[PDB]
Symmetry: D2
């Protein structure tokens, strides 16, 4: 019950990883405003958490759709303690040499409006409310904001850009708003599952969406993440610490120590 | 309580952050074995927490001592779920020009044996127990592990070195043990130093934090030691930090994202938005 | 001369650093094709370097233009050995609170289409030629690609984004093309901005560098534009930078390793050592 | 002829990568003082570069052996423009679980005295001379100061530590001395050569020691690396940008573009 008397806003939270955040957050005493594209999946979400969660149908790319989401949150809950810019769109890990000349301009704009511009507006929209409550932002980054091969050029640049957002907003919004980011990866949400545990994830297992929720709960806990601003907790099963020939270094440790 | 029924081993956990971690972890249900140089301070917490904490007097540079603590924790509690190598020595932020040629070699060894080697024996000792419980290692680092002026050549080099521990240990101990690092910043710890290093400069070059905070902490305040225990509990919680290994949490109040003319860039926000 | 007989394609290479790069590369024996928005400035250098440089007037956001330049370089010089995507737009370091709601969406696209998309079409265009000559891509980044207060939300996000280009392009174009990044810092460039962003604040928030240098540059001086061309030549040289791909050169005078109270920590060194 | 009228000091430079630096540096008009353990290989080096290179027999761990090396350089060349702390000792990539209880203390001290303490003294020794000439330091780091599996815990910590040295010395020695570091890796100097190009090095080829020399020449060039201080140029064939399933992303690019 770590988030008792708390209010959080989550974009793109009516599905995928953002939905897991919702369920968990509610299950922590929190109160979650949700901006998303799906009117149906927002209504199903709302009855799932009776009066602990509100949902506003919108387009994360729209600044106005973000201001509304802020306003409605303020309407029902009267405050905003943790904003979680999260709504993201993928590029199918498409290589540059495979992005066609007649599609690159559209593809760029769409992916950048959702992953970067979407995040900007959210923070812009909620700025009054966050300053008012001296709360925090926790962006959803990704393994792809730090290392390649998590996506194509478009995805990688958009997720490296939200690292800049983490840093610049951590600076600009201080001392009244703490900005942070979590970088999840290797998810139950291109690459074979057998090559995933062997050559990608040192931890050796595809974690459930529920297991990616705690890192966010942390940054949203009143006085547990107070020194945190500008922080980037990489949360991808250890993609940036994997070996050359094998992801895991000591798979055979138990019978190296006769445990 | 996140850590009910768990067992933590904190080194240097009788004073400072390492001690706040004990109080926090016990308060979070966990039982805590502690290795530290101070016999008094260990009894001081032994009484305070009753049958939830035990303390072993020894030295972090000694592997025998490290092993003795790891065994003591097994004897009393039956396992090791979280190991927190925390014990650290500051270099008074003494520059290279200020290091005495006759005192430098001695100094190196003193600081590197605690800040780095002490961590290695902490892991070496507790490893069998950690692979058995498929547990975690959470390293105390420092802002001095990522950016300069947090200490002199020696300290900054040590903390940077323990960044390399996180990464290697995360690799080597996959998939059973998780290894990560917490990097504290604006705490008001004295941070002890080596006798091999003289008293020469301890007040007027090692600058106090309150005097300079506007150039160091964006968050615009000095956090209490208890505000730094939250990150470690996070790593200590099995169902919260499961997909986290090789993770580096910069926990310095924004020392790495401070701005040029001042630390924080949004002093005038409430003026500009009306609160 | 390191780059005798080589061919470089610089974008935004008619003014600022991009233009100093032309002068340097020609002076290093290389022939240089240039894409830039200014017809005058391109003729200005066309005459200056004679048959060693050619310029194409167009826009970096346009792939057709990018392709047209890549072809122009083939037509005149016969190949492309080094591509330098350099053309960049500043956001006047305009904060998020200061971005007008009615002007923000327009602004985003303007800046992201040059700083990021412009780079992508630069690579997309010149790629066939680069895989053919097994050449290199050297990206102009910025201190704003690594640490904050070098620009507002938009600019810092763009440059950070092109860090992600370096890494992905380095991966994707292995083993034939090498992709790296140069990250300039204390140059006295005006760095143009978008009309979609108002004149509102251009003198008194976007602070001049000379006023603040003691809080920004450890090196304790503002380097001339010619001092920044050396890193690119390095990547342009086949026998010097062969085992370098995905490399990031922080070229900012020490912006990332500046200290808390002042940029440089060794002001008083010669006093302390006697020179 | 980029280093005409220049003087550089190189530790551990009578063999390995440090020797390649020497040959190249001399071949650039530079003048190289060399501190190393080998008396024979120092003499062979000296006749190889007649009067353009001096060599002083010493132990990099000794501060005094470093001061001498500085003094002798000053004797023959009268100045020191680029110091290159380079002498390094490896741990056989030995895992922690394989470092024996009766050896760990000795092994720690030896590897840390050479890789970290060796570097410190060099900069300490040459400080007067470098400040006097307003020159630079270029440490030899390694892929192992950034990612794991380049060595064991001991090597990785020692090379991560010299990253701290790069940063702290870049700060402390400014504005009079520029500190930098090069991070070479995947060298013709444990791991099979067939798994090296496939899963380790995106560039697909083990580069010669000569090809690792240019990066150092760069940092030592009068007015080509003036803005450089605190810089970390990773020089390992792209170990930190390799994919999950394959090092190289577009091996089959030529016949994807019918070049």
């Amino acid at each position: 019950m770590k988030l008792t008397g708390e209010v959080a806003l989550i974009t793109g939270g009516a599905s995928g990883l953002g939905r897991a955040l919702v369920d968990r957050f509610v299950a922590e005493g929190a109160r979650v405003a949700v901006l998303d594209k799906s009117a149906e999946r927002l209504r199903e979400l709302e009855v799932a958490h009776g009066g602990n969660a509100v949902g506003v149908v919108g387009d994360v790319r729209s600044l106005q759709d973000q201001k509304r989401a802020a306003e409605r949150c303020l309407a029902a809950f009267g405050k905003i303690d943790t904003l979680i810019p999260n709504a993201g769109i993928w590029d199918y890990s498409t290589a540059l040499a495979d992005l066609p000349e007649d599609k690159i301009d559209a593809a760029f704009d769409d992916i950048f409006h959702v992953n970067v511009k979407g995040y900007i507006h959210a923070v812009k929209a909620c700025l009054p409310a966050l300053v008012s409550s001296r709360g925090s932002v926790v962006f959803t980054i990704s393994n792809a904001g730090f290392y390649p091969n998590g996506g194509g050029p478009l995805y990688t640049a958009t997720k490296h850009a939200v690292v800049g957002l983490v840093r610049q907003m951590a600076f600009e919004l201080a001392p009244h708003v703490r900005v942070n980011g979590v970088a999840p990866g290797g998810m139950n949400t291109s690459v074979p599952l057998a090559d995933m545990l062997k050559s990608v994830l040192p931890i050796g297992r595809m974690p459930a969406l529920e297991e990616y929720t705690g890192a966010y709960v942390f940054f949203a806990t009143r006085g547990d993440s107070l020194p945190a601003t500008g922080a980037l907790l990489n949360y991808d099963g250890g993609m940036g610490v994997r070996g050359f020939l094998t992801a895991a270094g000591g798979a055979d440790l138990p019978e190296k120590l006769n445990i």
